[PDB]
Design an enzyme around this catalytic site. Structure first.
Site, short mmCIF file in Angstrom:
data_model
loop_
_atom_site.label_atom_id
_atom_site.label_comp_id
_atom_site.label_asym_id
_atom_site.label_seq_id
_atom_site.Cartn_x
_atom_site.Cartn_y
_atom_site.Cartn_z
N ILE A 16 42.80 42.33 50.57
CA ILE A 16 42.98 41.82 49.21
C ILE A 16 42.38 42.73 48.14
CG2 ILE A 16 43.06 39.38 49.92
CD1 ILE A 16 40.13 39.15 49.18
N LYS A 18 40.19 46.69 47.00
CA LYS A 18 40.17 48.13 47.18
C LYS A 18 38.84 48.77 46.80
CE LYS A 18 44.22 46.23 46.11
NZ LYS A 18 43.46 44.96 45.88
N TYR A 87 34.79 34.38 47.53
CA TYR A 87 36.18 34.68 47.23
C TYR A 87 36.58 34.04 45.91
CZ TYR A 87 41.25 34.61 47.31
OH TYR A 87 42.57 34.79 46.98
N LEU A 88 37.21 34.81 45.04
CA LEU A 88 37.68 34.28 43.76
C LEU A 88 39.16 34.56 43.62
CD1 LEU A 88 34.50 35.30 41.83
CD2 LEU A 88 35.37 32.99 41.95
N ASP A 130 28.24 48.51 35.09
CA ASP A 130 29.66 48.78 35.18
C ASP A 130 30.42 47.57 34.68
OD1 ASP A 130 31.90 50.39 35.68
OD2 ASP A 130 31.96 49.88 37.81
N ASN A 135 35.80 44.14 36.56
CA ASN A 135 34.66 43.65 37.32
C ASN A 135 34.25 42.25 36.86
OD1 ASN A 135 34.55 45.89 38.91
ND2 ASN A 135 33.05 46.99 37.64
N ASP A 148 30.90 43.30 41.71
CA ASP A 148 30.83 44.73 41.98
C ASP A 148 29.53 45.35 41.46
OD1 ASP A 148 31.52 47.25 42.79
OD2 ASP A 148 33.63 46.99 42.18
N1 LIG Z 1 34.05 43.27 44.70
C1 LIG Z 1 34.42 41.93 45.02
N2 LIG Z 1 33.46 41.02 45.25
C2 LIG Z 1 33.80 39.76 45.55
N3 LIG Z 1 32.78 38.80 45.80
N4 LIG Z 1 35.09 39.38 45.63
C3 LIG Z 1 36.05 40.29 45.40
C4 LIG Z 1 37.49 39.92 45.46
C5 LIG Z 1 38.42 40.95 45.42
C6 LIG Z 1 39.78 40.66 45.47
C7 LIG Z 1 40.21 39.35 45.57
C8 LIG Z 1 39.28 38.32 45.62
C9 LIG Z 1 37.93 38.60 45.57
O1 LIG Z 1 37.04 37.54 45.61
N5 LIG Z 1 35.71 41.57 45.09
#
Ligand SMILES: Nc1nc(N)nc(-c2ccccc2O)n1
Length: 285
Positions: A16, A18, A87-88, A130, A135, A148
């Site tokens: 999901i 990168k 997860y978001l 950042d 982010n 991030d």
């Molecule tokens: N760097 C990062 N950190 C978290 N905790 N989630 C995500 C993330 C990246 C893509 C899709 C869903 C997501 O929660 N990306």
């Protein structure tokens, strides 16, 4: 106090996310059946980024805020390191910009939640370093969190300022680029650039080569928000984008800015934006 055997607790699903960090996968907490995000880093492979990976885990593990991506744990699996987090599913603020412009209620709402995150971080003597729309992540129901922490900084009693050249050039504060001694006020500059990004779709200088903006930002007068935007929004940006960092307000102070107070509404209204992106993304080339 790292952990081991992640697959005993988590199921790894599809990709999901990168970055050059590593890669991000959807996952399931087998305990609660909540969905999580699993960042997989090949330690055999991303040499010297190691110090940054260590820093990301350290900062993550020390944060406990609804405005910062929840940290589950870091896990050793042979050659790989699993960093497991919240997860978001609502995409990033940058995603939300893709189908078209925001209105000032949306901009204010998003900025207010970013500010709650920054106030938390800065109260913990942490600097994100950042801040940018990419982010800033949303849940599917409009909750807004900072993500991030790969270049996040920590201040201590013996290190009251940071000096490191990190960040994303369009969003970087002039004192960061000059590598002067800086602190949380650097995030406030980035927040101002992020406000222009949310209003205009892109940061100042976005069509120029990043190396170029590295001299343009310390030299030029600070960007201003140009166009038909409310005076409080323009003054919000102006407040953030002061070349002298001690003249920028704190996150706390900005939470009481007239632009925020007059225009921010419930985060659940942001689902309208999340739905717009989902629709847009589904009919895309
Ligand atoms: N760097 C990062 N950190 C978290 N905790 N989630 C995500 C993330 C990246 C893509 C899709 C869903 C997501 O929660 N990306």
């Amino acid at each position: 106090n790292l952990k081991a055997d992640p697959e005993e607790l988590f199921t790894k699903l599809e990709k999901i996310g990168k970055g050059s960090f590593g890669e991000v996968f959807k996952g399931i907490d087998n305990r609660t059946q909540k969905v999580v995000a699993i960042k997989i880093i090949d330690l055999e492979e991303a040499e010297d980024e190691i110090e940054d990976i260590q820093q990301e885990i350290t900062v993550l593990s020390q944060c406990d805020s609804p405005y910062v991506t929840k940290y589950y744990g870091s896990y050793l699996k042979d050659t790989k390191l699993w960093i497991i987090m919240e997860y978001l599913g609502g995409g990033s603020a940058l995603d939300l910009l893709e189908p078209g412009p925001l209105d000032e209620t949306q901009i204010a709402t998003i900025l207010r939640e970013i500010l709650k995150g920054l106030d938390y971080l800065h109260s913990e003597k942490k600097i994100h370093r950042d801040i940018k729309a990419a982010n800033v992540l949303l849940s599917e129901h409009g909750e807004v969190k900072l993500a991030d922490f790969g270049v996040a900084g920590q201040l201590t009693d013996t290190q009251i300022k940071r000096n490191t050249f990190v960040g994303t050039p369009f969003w970087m504060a002039p004192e960061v680029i000059k590598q002067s001694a800086y602190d949380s006020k650097a995030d406030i500059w980035s927040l101002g650039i992020t406000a222009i990004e949310l209003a205009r779709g892109e940061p100042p200088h976005s069509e120029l080569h990043p190396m170029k903006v590295l001299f343009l930002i310390p030299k030029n007068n600070p960007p201003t928000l140009e166009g038909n935007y409310s005076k409080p929004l323009k003054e919000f940006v102006e407040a953030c984008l002061n070349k002298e960092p001690s003249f920028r307000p704190t996150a706390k102070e900005l939470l009481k800015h007239k632009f925020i107070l007059r225009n921010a509404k419930k985060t659940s209204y942001l689902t309208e934006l999340i739905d717009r992106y989902k629709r847009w993304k589904a009919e895309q080339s």
